[PDB]
Amino acid sequence: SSNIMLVLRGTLEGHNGWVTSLSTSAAQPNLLVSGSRDKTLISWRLTENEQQFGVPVRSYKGHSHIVQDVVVSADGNYAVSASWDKTLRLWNLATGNSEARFVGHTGDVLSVAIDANSSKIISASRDKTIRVWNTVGDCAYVLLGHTDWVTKVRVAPKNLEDVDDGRITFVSAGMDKIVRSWSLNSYRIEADFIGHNNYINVVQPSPDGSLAASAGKDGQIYVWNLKHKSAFMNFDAKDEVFALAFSPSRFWLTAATASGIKIYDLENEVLIDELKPEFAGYTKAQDPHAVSLAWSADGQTLFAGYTDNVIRVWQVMTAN
Amino acid sequence: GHVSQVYAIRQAIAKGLVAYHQKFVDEQSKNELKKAFTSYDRTLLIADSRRPEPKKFGGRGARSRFQKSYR
Amino acid sequence: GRVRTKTVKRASKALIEKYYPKLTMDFQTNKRLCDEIATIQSKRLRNKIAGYTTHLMKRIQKGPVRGISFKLQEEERERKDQYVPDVSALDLSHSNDVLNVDTQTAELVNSLGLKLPLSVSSVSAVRDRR
RNA sequence: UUAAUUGCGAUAACGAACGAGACCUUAACCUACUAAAUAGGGUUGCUGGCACUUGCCGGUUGACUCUUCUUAGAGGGACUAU
Ligand SMILES: [Mg+2]
Ligand SMILES: [Mg+2]
């Protein structure tokens, strides 16, 4: 069932480091902000005309070191960048100038998260701490509880929780081999998740906000319930799964293995497609794997940022 | 000196054009400027790495000796 | 003329042998690991140590290498060593319970006073010219 | 193999010490931080001239503002990275 094929449609060249992270806003479907190892963000405007799927719009210089995680705002006009210089930068997606410079992390920041609304900034850093900031730039909360580096923090979207609660729930994980849930208004702890043999590289709540998908070094992908606080399922990737992403339309998990990109069909608990682009002049042992994955707003296109300084887009082309 | 100043103006004008196009114009414009520049006299956008060598005792030059007698 | 003298090589070897699960393929992550898990005094030595650690990690990823060892590799070696075939490789499991000998060891078996089902065959005492 | 008794190694040699390296000063790169009437810049004053269109080149220790260059501190950066 669902004989869905996805074919590479364009390549977004222009970066100079590994495209570490990607982000896309639901409101604005034709804009894609990507941060790389070249200490710069790039805003891409997508064109449905011919080979190249997008067009760079603005480069955001101002970061001294590696740019690790990138997050765009809900409205699609602001972008928060986490870099390896222990600072966070807020950028206007049109002006190109920085608005706020969040400072206070003693370790280089690995991940940042946007609030569901435009209120709070959640950042994870190597200093074993999480920081909650206002949009102005000051740090409101210093959440502790992790004894090691925290690699990833992305918010669980409130879908239909009771009506309304005004409570901000997200997850955090890193080299503590644990996954933690946090709730904000106040701004304290929630349930735990301990399933990983090795350390967690990346976690990601489902688009609805009721499934949390975590991955690590051993390629053991775990799916948990947050609102039910229990495990949902478990798979093995048998390679180094660098990043993973849910899909808005389909019930899918893209996983960036060290060999290629797997897609797992969640309802059938079986992988369906494997993505391995064709390079040239290599030795098959160092083919550029994927580090960033991001689906489109509708769920029709997939952006993968590799280690060869390239974004590649796979458009869903169902060949019957 | 004179020619050093001239090369300084060269690089300054080129870098100003590139930076302005990056900041306020567009990405492709700046990339096209960089393709036109760096394909010609790379120093137009990259500062020269060569700087003078400190002098040392035992010679009138930075890396030259005075002379020997032997007799 | 970069040869990476004793200190960096030994430190990287110990780093791998004590921290393989945490080390990665990337230079920058391993640089941060070298900063946090080890007290290298200067930073040029830190960069050299991280670089050689990355090189040794890449060599390990390509395959097993001499000198260095770690928990996972020695466990794998022990598990491969514990391999014992279920099928017998002796006691005439092959050649339909018949093993071939010559006269001399047949008389050896006979004088030993043991039954030992055998199969005689002359060895054609003419030797190969090589 | 290395500039190196620098390493890979083979081994009645095993572990080590000095030297080399490491290390400091200095020269780069920092539109990332801290800042500056004993360094510079912008806007605007108060003026000079030429143009006459709102502009050009100037002067003022008059004000507001900034740190790109000039400085110097904490740091980053290169480890033969891919
Ligand atoms: Mg001279
Ligand atoms: Mg400066």
Swiss-Prot record, chain B:
Cysteine-cysteine disulfides: none
Positions of region (Disordered): 51-71
Compositionally biased intervals (Basic residues): 62-71
Entry's family note: Belongs to the universal ribosomal protein uS9 family.
Stated name of the protein: Small ribosomal subunit protein uS9
UniProt organism field: Kluyveromyces lactis (strain ATCC 8585 / CBS 2359 / DSM 70799 / NBRC 1267 / NRRL Y-1140 / WM37) (Yeast)
Gene name tied to this protein: RPS16
